[PDB]
């Protein structure tokens, strides 16, 4: 248990009341308190879960992310103004950090705080003991769902390695004089081992902020830190799925025939793949209980819906994206029946799948990758949003995010590729490229067909299939696969003429070649150029 004195050490004073590690029951009662007003206020939906509103911020704010440049982080961090390649690791002075800290601690002073102690990492030897402090009940609920909930025995000897203070209600009015992006802030200090959040209510900032910390600590110890989902079959076969947001990591790893290890952040050490989290954070936009039953059923009491539209009668309108297309729901991992327990970990991965939502409709549904192409595509981290608000006519805008999660990388991309490659090699892991995106029909490939391709990969149907090489990208695509429509395996078939495909394939190839040029500093990246597309 905590005391007002342990908080005073953090710089927080006059603490009225501490709600230490609240149970789901209390949180439920706290969120439904009819006296709550504003963004703290939750509503009860017909499914039994409470729905909240994160306010103005319905997603992350990378432009407000800062890391203090001191003697601990100077020579190790991948700085946005130092290292080649664009990133969000903006340097912050120790003095400006102290100003932001003052703003947050004064904000949490004289309040009734919610303190949640949890773990980030399923293995005791590499895990972080994090202490979350907030004045908003649903934020404590979010960290309870997302992080690893300690047992009574573990809380007994609990010593926080990292502290995260959420001062969402406060903003920095001096930001203009200090040279920051805005009045908001998501700052990190590795000397003090702390995270400060101000102005933004979005819970994703606490989750991804700790992921960014694991992404810094782990690789330096020779452990792969990955933005991937993961599951194991009955035979002990572990599969990992990399990919950016909305590409299918969550919808595809939640397979009723395989034990879910995790859905978003995993490490890979000598023993194998381990989850960092204690829950799942699924996307609910246009959620169908028919296509994704396990995820739909995980939405019940204790799950936390965010930004979804709740009608007057309590029913949820999952199709409504008027506020945001990034509607979410977090829930304890146990809301999914088929999962690995008690500890979310398994053996080494032998199947590495890179998911990509190709808006250009150029990439094939599935391709077996060569060792060089694995490394080339990992560092490229391609995805394409069919943006332009789709009120214009067409706009397949691409995104090249190194390691399929550049937004959370604390070290140079190659450091991630390196530890990952050595792990894949010791395990004899195979890599595959999967397009959960578009083809020539202008429609996204159905979840049904994608799941069939994932099955073909996991059971070796793909590995034994006869394959031919796709021009330019030089991808080995299967001639056919059991359960999947043969017409779609070759992307050129979905076009009226293979000449239509050709045009776009060249455009995408140039984008890839242009993008990869920022890795041709070393003989390694220069060597991998032969693994990329050629016109
Ligand atoms: N063929 C498909 N494969 C995977 N996801 C698909 C597919 N078609 C549509 N989707 C939708 O795309 C989104 C993928 O989201 P999710 O798995 O949550 O992304 P990630 O976990 O990688 O951010 C979901 O909203 C899902 O319903
Ligand atoms: Mg996900």
Curated annotation (Swiss-Prot):
MF terms in GO: ATP binding; calcium ion binding; magnesium ion binding; phosphoenolpyruvate carboxykinase (ATP) activity
InterPro entries assigned: PEP_carboxykinase_ATP, PEP_carboxykinase_C, PEP_carboxykinase_N, PEPCK_ATP_CS
Source domain of life: Bacteria
Organismal lineage: Bacteria, Pseudomonadati, Pseudomonadota, Gammaproteobacteria, Enterobacterales
Positions bound to substrate: 60, 202, 208, 328
Main location: cytoplasm
Protein name stated in the entry: Phosphoenolpyruvate carboxykinase (ATP)
Organism: Escherichia coli (strain K12)
PANTHER family according to UniProt: PHOSPHOENOLPYRUVATE CARBOXYKINASE (ATP), PHOSPHOENOLPYRUVATE CARBOXYKINASE ATP
Pfam short name (any one): PEPCK_ATP
EC identifiers of the protein: 4.1.1.49
Induction trigger: Induced upon entry into stationary phase and by cyclic AMP (cAMP). Repressed by glucose (catabolite repression) and by CsrA.
Gene behind the chain: pckA
Pathway assigned in UniProt: Carbohydrate biosynthesis; gluconeogenesis
Reported function: Involved in the gluconeogenesis. Catalyzes the conversion of oxaloacetate (OAA) to phosphoenolpyruvate (PEP) through direct phosphoryl transfer between the nucleoside triphosphate and OAA.
Binding site for Mn(2+): 208, 227, 264
């Amino acid at each position: 248990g905590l005391t007002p004195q342990e908080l005073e050490a953090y710089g927080i004073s006059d603490v009225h009341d501490i709600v230490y590690n609240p149970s789901y029951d209390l949180l439920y009662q706290e969120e439904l308190d009819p006296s709550l007003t504003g963004y703290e206020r939750g509503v009860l939906t017909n499914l039994g879960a409470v729905a909240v509103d994160t306010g103005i911020f319905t997603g992350r704010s990378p432009k407000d992310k800062y890391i203090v440049r001191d003697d601990t982080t100077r020579d190790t961090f991948w700085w946005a103004d130092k290292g080649k390649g664009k990133n969000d690791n903006k340097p912050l002075s120790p003095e400006t950090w102290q100003h932001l800290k003052g703003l947050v601690t004064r904000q949490l002073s004289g309040k009734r705080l919610f303190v949640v102690d949890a773990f980030c990492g399923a293995n005791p030897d590499t895990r972080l003991s994090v202490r979350f402090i907030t004045e908003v009940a649903w934020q404590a609920h979010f960290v309870k769902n997302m992080f690893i909930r300690p047992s009574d025995e573990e809380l007994a000897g609990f010593k926080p390695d990292f502290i995260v203070m959420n001062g969402a209600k406060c903003t920095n009015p001096q930001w203009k004089e200090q040279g920051l992006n805005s009045e908001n802030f998501v700052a990190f200090n590795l000397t003090e081992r702390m995270q400060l959040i101000g102005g933004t209510w979005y819970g994703g900032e606490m989750k991804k902020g700790m992921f960014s910390m694991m992404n810094y600590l782990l690789p330096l110890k020779g452990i792969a830190s990955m933005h991937c989902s993961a599951n194991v079959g009955e035979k002990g076969d572990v599969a990992v799925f990399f990919g950016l947001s909305g590409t299918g990591k969550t919808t595809l790893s939640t397979d009723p025939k395989r034990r879910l290890i995790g859905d978003d952040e995993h490490g890979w050490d000598d023993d194998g793949v381990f989850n960092f989290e204690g829950g799942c954070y699924a996307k609910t936009i246009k959620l169908s209980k028919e296509a994704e039953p396990e995820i739909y059923n995980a939405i019940r009491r204790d799950a936390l819906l965010e930004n979804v539209t709740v009608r007057e009668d309590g029913t949820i309108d999952f199709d409504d994206g008027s506020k945001t297309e990034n509607t979410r729901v977090s829930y304890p991992i146990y809301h999914i029946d088929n999962i690995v327990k008690p500890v979310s970990k398994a053996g080494h991965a032998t199947k590495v799948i890179f998911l990509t939502a190709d808006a250009f409709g150029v990439l094939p549904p599935v391709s077996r990758l060569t060792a060089d192409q694995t490394q080339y595509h990992f560092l490229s981290g391609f995805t394409a949003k069919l943006a332009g608000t789709e009120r214009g006519i067409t706009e397949p805008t691409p995104t090249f995010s190194a390691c399929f999660g550049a937004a959370f990388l604390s070290l140079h991309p190659t450091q991630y590729a390196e530890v990952l490659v050595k792990r894949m090699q010791a395990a004899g892991a195979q890599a595959y490229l999967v397009n959960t995106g578009w083809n020539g029909t202008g429609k996204r490939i159905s979840i049904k067909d994608t799941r069939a391709i994932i099955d073909a990969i996991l059971n070796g149907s793909l590995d034994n299939a006869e394959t031919f090489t796709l021009p330019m990208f030089n991808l080995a695509i299967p001639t056919e696969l059991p359960g999947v429509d043969t017409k779609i395996l070759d992307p050129r078939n979905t076009y009226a003429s293979p000449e239509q495909w050709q045009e776009k394939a060249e455009t995408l190839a140039k984008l890839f070649i242009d993008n990869f040029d920022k890795y041709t500093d070393t003989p390694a990246g220069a060597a991998l150029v032969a693994a990329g597309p050629k016109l």
